[PDB]
Design a protein around this ligand. Structure first.
Ligand SMILES: CCCCCCCCCCCCCCCCCC(=O)O
Ligand SMILES: CCCCCCCCCCCCCCCCCC(=O)O
Ligand SMILES: N[C@@H](CCC(=O)N[C@@H](CS)C(=O)NCC(=O)O)C(=O)O
Ligand SMILES: N[C@@H](CCC(=O)N[C@@H](CS)C(=O)NCC(=O)O)C(=O)O
Ligand SMILES: [K+]
Ligand SMILES: [K+]
Ligand SMILES: [K+]
Ligand SMILES: [K+]
Ligand SMILES: [K+]
Ligand SMILES: [K+]
Ligand SMILES: [K+]
Ligand SMILES: [K+]
Lengths: 243, 48, 244, 271, 194, 244, 271, 48
């Protein structure tokens, strides 16, 4: 026999190990691979697909209504419409999105984000709104003047129903932790900032038209986005054997 | 990252015995992100 | 020119067999997974009998009974091929054969006025299970040509998030923008062919995410109509007619 | 009939420096979600960017990297020195939720078995004993007792190991009669039956059962067994909407309705 | 090819179980026999060569050769139709329904036998060899039925036997294969052998 | 070798679609007017819609209910396409389309024994009118799959001589010689296509000209069976199903 | 004098598209089983077929794939610290029935031995003990006791292992004096004797015995042993009609007569 | 299925020690299915 010396690790079962092992059916011949549409090779292909943000996560909103950002004819100027932390992996409106689910399967992320909004009022309903991304350092902007100093887009309601605000990757480090859990890890360190929306002018409508309307909010990863360190999704759990 | 040099010899008869695949690339996501018939260029308006 | 300027024209014409569908307010056309329907390859096939390919007799547009966008409307869905299992020669070929394979061209219609607002998600979902009940009722898993009303839209009737249904081929009918959605769907399955009376490969859902509202006094009765055409179909295992 | 190409990449996209743009021609920001297409507005078109040669990889999100690790699929204790486990991955939710992210998938699997002896009070024992795990395909006779003739296993594959040895481990090929496993099936298990209990399950996903026994009788103690499964050489099709409700049953995707996924906050204007 | 134990009824014992009974009719379009074509399930097929080996495996694929040999007198004539009904419903109830499927019309004559090929017509490339339902729900794989009917009638001269027999043979075709070896359920023991 | 020696072999096999018919006592095969079925030429066609050509789903053998050669048997007849108008996908395609065109392969079966004697004329007659009554009954002009019994065989139900029916494609089933007749028929009409629910292009008749007799004690119950396959068919003018 | 060739194939036969046929010439469907030949009617001749490039393999049904796995052939407990097992494969029916599917066969074998200590009540013990398995060819002296001189095993092959080590395993060549083992023998064991007990057994199939002992005396406990055998490099001739009745004796194929193999159904016309 | 590349070196003296054969093909079954002297073509009748 060839002299050998076995080492530490011998006999261990590392779940992420990658060895060759005997097959239960050494001569088995599988069915042929047939042509099936929609092959996916990497989940980055999935997170780049836009999905709805559960943005109106308030007590008065149930089910489907939680996807609608409320808009209404104003009687004052420069008012706020919505606010949200841009972090894709933290608890909140982003957690149930495609991007959020996969981000929650990992410990770190990087990349620009695509936030697209679609106005759903009548053809006659007009309006201009400003959507801003505030890089970290302080709290969310308190008014439109402060918000507009950051990255932003001014959206004009019209034939092209939607607008995209790209939240560019602006970070000290190449990656950020996906959680901002503070008590233990002090990960608030990684906060990516905020996205806020304000009336640029006002929502305006003809006589007897609905004075309230909705905006749907979409989010997806950009082509420079990636994830690292797989981890179990915190949303999936069980307390006992399943029926 | 991954080694540019490493041993990859199969000791078993069936491919099912082999270690994990080592490709790991991604592909353009258009079949999922933009499954449309008409091209809508980034610089133009989507509908006319 | 749409091609030269890089945009999609809002008008469209869909012609299959003896049927032609037009719209003047479309939002491009979706082709599921970027794949048009295709015939079964000799290298993928397993059933050895020469298939029947009905052509225009089955590959044409079939319009189903309309559904009203009521004030309490939660959405509506149709299973495929279930919804057309008893319509025309497509239905007959589906019934007389054990095996069926085919793609689809779906056109969802809903017009209102520039005085109305509302938004419908029009999505074609592969293997869409109606599993909100401990023991799903056949009336809901296979509602036929009338389709079935949604009871749990937020959870997509299957325990997932409605907002993530966008991962499946879809479009939206946002009244201020368009009055129709068009989707071309290839055959999808883990098999070359399958039974059209035991398995529904796709499920078409039309779900209101932004409720229908309008200027006071406007027409309140707004229907939603679905017109579907089988495309590139083939059948094997001929025998007497059998329905589920 | 594939009109959309899928070129491969080994790194994420670079950022190229861009300058200002004041025009009526190019309007990258204007979009239309109604088309079903995700926005194509690029970073460089929305703000002035700098050059960034981005070498970030994409490996850890590949199907192989995401699925390529072991997860618990079975856990039980023998009774009378034997236990029959029907091979299915719906009992333990973690791996289950992962698999349901794809509609169809082909893959080989590496099964790892960890076993030890426990007493009547479920206290682990330092006791080395030989155990046998036999794969019984559908149609083959399942042993009723710890010493039935089927344990001869002349055709059924069996793996005999010891609680004193490292965990047992064997690879299995893609065994379905189908051309891919299905993690979502909108159909019934048979013709002529439309009962709810026969809905949403594709029989070809069930390859049989694993029957476990100790080769000889333990005295008052039992064999505790955990079975782990690791997908290998994964090929997948048609990504699915992720599970967003707790699982309730092992064989169905039934769930409890809910009016919200994420928790509520005071107001939409306060992040 | 090996013989199918087709007449597996209470009144048939031993060798008689291989004979399909045929007799001069006084009515038309009548049925002669029926059988599920699945080669690995319990029934007439289980004791055949094809059946035994199929029972040593979990999955099968391929067309099947069902050949029949008429054994009446040289003067005994007849025409019968043998049909294969692909799955979806129950076995055909009458000749009209049966003839809509794959079939062959057999004319008794010098060439004593006829072959009905049950072509491989399946959704998947393979089928499970058992149709056990309670646990695995394998009824999913049912391959269909083979039925036989009088096309015309069995006709004989004066004082000839008015009953005759048909022997039934079955075998795998050249596109047939089996996967996943398993212990044959028919072989067992309750203790040590003498 | 049949070709080398210049004779016709008494055995035959007819395979169409998923059906195979065999006989060991044939008397050659007749091909009506020496013409096999053919598709409609672009220079003969008039209906402009792309036709449906069902293929194997309809071009296969359909066996009709048998008829008994009773002691008082005068003969039996079936109209085409009437007899198959409600059978399989051929029937469905016939019903769902205004226009139909097609040929046929007919196999008539009647076996007895070398102890029986009898002779049946098996003739396929173009435009065969059942006009013995002042006002023909629909039950007799279109008897369906069951066919109808002859009442006036000598006058061929149309005022002509039975003996001259030989001018039409035919064969005989003379028990001492053969037990089956096979005829291939091309589409015949004064038009490119026609309605399958208003016009029967051919009529198959099986008429006893020499009564069935046999050695005392022989089997007395002798059926006659007809198996017919549509061949080279095409349909135009699709709509809902309509029967006569 | 071989008039029938046997070309090799690695995949099942393809299906080629076929069209209709209306003729008096070719009659593929007409057959005659009296000739002793199996029908030669092909799929393409009986119905109209499509093209099917069939890549299904034939590997799992090869003799090597069918026989190439371990099966139980012996199981016993020592008595007085010793046990004598006559090498024969008629004790356990599963492997036995497999071998009888061939008339003649040559093959090497891999023997695997699994052993553990059990007490008087047949309860397994966690006790590591050295054991010896000695192959005693016919004509060699068989030890009467656990400590007899034959255990010196200077010529007889022996394998010494421990219940605390993995199962012992050794390969054996094709050892028969014949040119193949026989799994069916219509003859007697000797000249000058026609007693029934000497019929149907070919002596050359018996290569000796395995005698087992623990190297030193166990105190009140016994050694439980299981012997598995795996045929390798199989060459076979003349397929046989499969066993269709239960086995009753270890050395003979005697059986109980029966009037049916499969169970009865109500009528031949109801599937 | 089986690997197109895998190690196959024998470590032992006797062939009996070698791992299982890796051929596994099948042969035309005519010696069992059609062991007849006269060829009976598929398109012709068996006996005349
Ligand atoms: C003797 C060695 C024992 C090792 C275990 C062998 C197990 C063989 C079965 C392999 C099938 C795995 C795929 C199942 C995937 C489908 C799961 C599900 O839908 O619930
Ligand atoms: C020392 C190592 C012990 C290992 C065991 C060695 C056994 C040697 C005997 C090999 C003979 C095997 C072939 C017997 C086949 C015939 C069986 C039968 O007909 O019952
Ligand atoms: N306490 C019980 C039940 C424990 C149990 O079943 N735990 C489940 C979750 S509810 C599990 O997944 N355990 C993982 C493991 O123990 O490996 C026992 O130990 O028998
Ligand atoms: N219960 C007895 C007899 C058990 C026995 O002999 N079982 C036979 C079948 S009847 C067998 O093949 N057992 C397989 C095994 O235990 O490995 C014992 O354990 O001593
Ligand atoms: K066609
Ligand atoms: K790069
Ligand atoms: K744009
Ligand atoms: K984007
Ligand atoms: K065609
Ligand atoms: K091949
Ligand atoms: K022949
Ligand atoms: K054959």
């Amino acid at each position: 026999g060839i002299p050998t010396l076995y080492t530490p690790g011998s006999g261990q079962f590392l779940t992420t190990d990658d060895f060759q092992t005997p097959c239960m059916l050494p001569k088995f011949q599988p069915t042929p691979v047939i042509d099936i549409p929609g092959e996916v090779k990497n989940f980055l292909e999935v997170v780049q697909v836009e999905s709805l943000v559960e943005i109106n996560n308030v007590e008065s909103a149930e089910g489907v209504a939680r996807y609608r950002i409320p808009l209404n004819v104003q009687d004052a100027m420069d008012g706020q419409i919505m606010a949200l932390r841009v972090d894709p992996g933290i608890d909140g409106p982003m957690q149930s999105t495609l991007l959020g689910v996969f981000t929650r399967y990992y410990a770190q992320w990087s990349g620009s984000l695509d936030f697209t909004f679609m106005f759903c009022g009548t053809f006659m309903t007009t309006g201009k709104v400003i959507i801003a991304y505030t890089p970290p350092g302080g709290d969310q902007p308190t008014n439109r003047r402060q918000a507009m100093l950051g990255t932003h887009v001014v959206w004009d309601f019209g034939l092209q129903s939607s607008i995209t605000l790209v939240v560019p990757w602006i970070s000290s480090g190449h990656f950020r932790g996906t959680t901002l859990e503070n008590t233990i890890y002090k990960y608030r360190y990684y906060e990516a900032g905020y996205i806020t929306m304000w009336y640029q002018t006002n929502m305006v409508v003809p006589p007897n038209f609905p004075t309230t309307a909705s905006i749907l909010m979409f989010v997806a990863a950009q082509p420079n986005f990636s994830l690292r360190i797989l981890k179990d999704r915190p949303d999936i759990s069980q307390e006992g054997a399943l029926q | 990252g991954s080694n540019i040099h490493y041993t990859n010899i199969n000791y078993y008869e069936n491919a099912a015995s082999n270690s994990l695949n080592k490709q790991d690339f991604t592909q353009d996501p258009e079949k999922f992100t933009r499954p449309v018939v008409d091209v809508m260029k980034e610089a133009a308006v989507p509908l006319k | 020119s749409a091609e030269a300027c890089g945009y999609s024209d809002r008008v469209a014409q869909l012609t299959l067999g003896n049927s032609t569908i037009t719209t003047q307010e479309a939002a491009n056309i979706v082709v599921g997974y970027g794949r048009w329907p295709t015939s079964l390859r000799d290298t993928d096939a397993t059933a050895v009998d020469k298939p029947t390919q009905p052509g225009v007799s089955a590959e044409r547009f079939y319009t189903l009974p309309s559904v009203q966008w009521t004030n309490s409307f939660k959405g509506h869905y149709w299973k495929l091929p279930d919804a057309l299992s008893e319509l025309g020669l497509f239905g007959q070929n589906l019934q007389f054969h054990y095996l069926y394979r085919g793609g689809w061209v779906i056109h969802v219609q809903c017009n209102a006025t520039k005085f109305h607002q509302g938004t419908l998600l029009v999505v074609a979902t592969p293997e869409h299970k109606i599993q909100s009940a401990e023991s799903p009722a056949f009336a809901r898993t296979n509602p036929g040509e009338q389709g079935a009303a949604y009871q749990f839209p937020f959870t997509f009737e299957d325990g997932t998030a409605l907002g993530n249904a966008l991962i499946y081929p879809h479009q939206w009918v946002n009244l201020r923008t368009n009055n129709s959605a068009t989707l071309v769907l290839p055959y999808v399955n883990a098999l070359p062919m399958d039974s059209g009376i035991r398995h529904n490969n796709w499920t078409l859902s039309v779900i209101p995410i932004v409720p229908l509202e309008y200027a006071a006094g406007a027409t309140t009765y707004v229907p939603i109509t679905v017109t579907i055409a089988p495309m590139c179909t083939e059948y094997n295992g001929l025998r007497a007619a059998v329905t589920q | 009939g594939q009109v959309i190409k899928s070129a491969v990449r080994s790194t994420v996209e670079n950022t190229v420096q861009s300058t200002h743009s004041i025009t009526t021609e190019a309007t990258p920001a204007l979009q239309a979600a109604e088309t079903g297409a995700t926005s194509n507005a690029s970073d460089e078109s929305m703000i002035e960017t700098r050059n960034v040669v981005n070498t970030h990889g994409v490996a850890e999100t590949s199907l192989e990297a995401f699925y390529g690790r072991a997860g618990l699929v079975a856990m039980f204790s023998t009774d009378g020195g034997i236990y029959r486990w029907y091979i299915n991955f719906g009992e333990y939710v973690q791996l289950r939720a992962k698999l349901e992210l794809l509609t169809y998938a082909r893959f080989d699997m590496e099964f790892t078995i960890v076993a030890q002896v426990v007493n009547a009070q479920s206290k682990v024992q330092d006791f080395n004993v030989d155990y046998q795990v036999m794969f019984v395909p559908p149609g083959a006779s399942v042993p009723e007792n710890q010493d039935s003739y089927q344990w001869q296993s002349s055709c059924n594959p069996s793996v005999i190991s010891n609680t004193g040895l490292p965990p047992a481990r064997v690879s299995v090929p893609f065994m379905s009669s189908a051309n891919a496993y299905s993690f979502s099936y909108d159909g019934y298990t048979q013709f002529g039956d439309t009962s709810g209990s026969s809905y949403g399950i594709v029989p070809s996903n069930y390859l049989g059962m694993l029957v476990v026994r100790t080769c000889e009788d333990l005295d008052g103690t039992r064999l505790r067994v955990r079975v782990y499964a690791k997908p290998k050489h994964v090929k997948g099709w048609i990504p699915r909407s992720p599970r967003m409700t707790p699982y309730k049953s092992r064989y169905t995707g039934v769930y409890t309705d809910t009016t919200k996924f994420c928790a509520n906050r005071a107001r939409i204007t306060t992040a």
